[PDB]
Amino acid sequence: ERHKILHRLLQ
Amino acid sequence: ADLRALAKHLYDSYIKSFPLTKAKARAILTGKTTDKSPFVIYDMNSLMMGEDKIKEQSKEVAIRIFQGCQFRSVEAVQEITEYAKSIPGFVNLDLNDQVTLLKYGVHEIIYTMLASLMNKDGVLISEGQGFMTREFLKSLRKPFGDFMEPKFEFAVKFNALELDDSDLAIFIAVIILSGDRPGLLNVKPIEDIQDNLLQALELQLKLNHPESSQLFAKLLQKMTDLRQIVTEHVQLLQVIKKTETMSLHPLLQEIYKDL
Lengths: 11, 259
Ligand SMILES: CC[C@H](NC(=O)c1ccc2c(c1)c(C)c(C)n2Cc1ccc(-c2ccccc2C(=O)O)cc1)c1ccccc1
Prior knowledge:
Chain B: This is Peroxisome proliferator-activated receptor gamma. The structure holds two protein chains of two kinds. By secondary structure, chain A is an all-alpha fold. Chain A is built from one helix and no strands. In chain B, helix 1 (3-17) packs across helix 9 and helix 4 crosses helix 5 (95-114). The chains are: A mainly alpha, B mainly alpha. The structure holds the ligand CC[C@H](NC(=O)c1ccc2c(c1)c(C)c(C)n2Cc1ccc(-c2ccccc2C(=O)O)cc1)c1ccccc1. The ligand CC[C@H](NC(=O)c1ccc2c(c1)c(C)c(C)n2Cc1ccc(-c2ccccc2C(=O)O)cc1)c1ccccc1 binds at residues 65-66, 68-73, 76, 107, 110, 114, 117, 123, 125-126, 132, 233, 237, 252 of chain B.
């Protein structure tokens, strides 16, 4: 939520 | 777990995720290839020549270099994230925790692996095609003169352990699965994984470094030194925030936000 890019890298 | 199978799995994944290994870096740094020598960068003219010979951007050296480090850090975060996904159990963790582990783990990992690219006199750059001298980096105008020097200090001590890629693959996995990161929702399953990783690391070091029976203990104690570098780096970034009227890549801003 607060980490859009990291979240995308992770999924 | 089969601890030898785990160690092998992690090594194979590390090799797939990280294109410049310590093995390749050491070959280059000791001149044991497979040349020609990397282009040596020690001043502004050689930096400029290096850009020609060969491969918003500041025409100022200190910022140019700082920007290069940002770009490479953005790449490192992606490689590390790919690697994290290959650690057994990691992708089954709560997604908020996965993000937390990466957020707080990447600096420790980046600086651990940066040592692989360093000797006491400089650091390999641009996938090993260049070598940037430590004294040159030290000579950059304030506040950037102190940007790299703590990384080098750490690296000289850490490289004295003589770890190889198979050791490092497991150590980096141990770093990722750190149950003491601020904000973690389910600490237990992270520690269960780290416990298996520490076992694998211990066996790996015992078997492959027979002369230094307490290398495992020595390696775990490097965390203070590593975290100290990270603290000094964050502090310098604050000074840079005030002094430079500077832009930080969005992924890095994301990592630093509420760090
Ligand atoms: C995670 C915090 C982040 N990164 C670092 O502090 C950091 C510093 C150095 C790093 C690294 C990380 C990594 C991963 C490496 C390999 N290096 C070495 C390196 C050396 C030279 C260049 C370089 C300089 C000029 C022109 C081209 C290059 C080039 O090689 O492309 C790039 C990287 C940070 C946060 C905020 C600002 C800057 C850096």
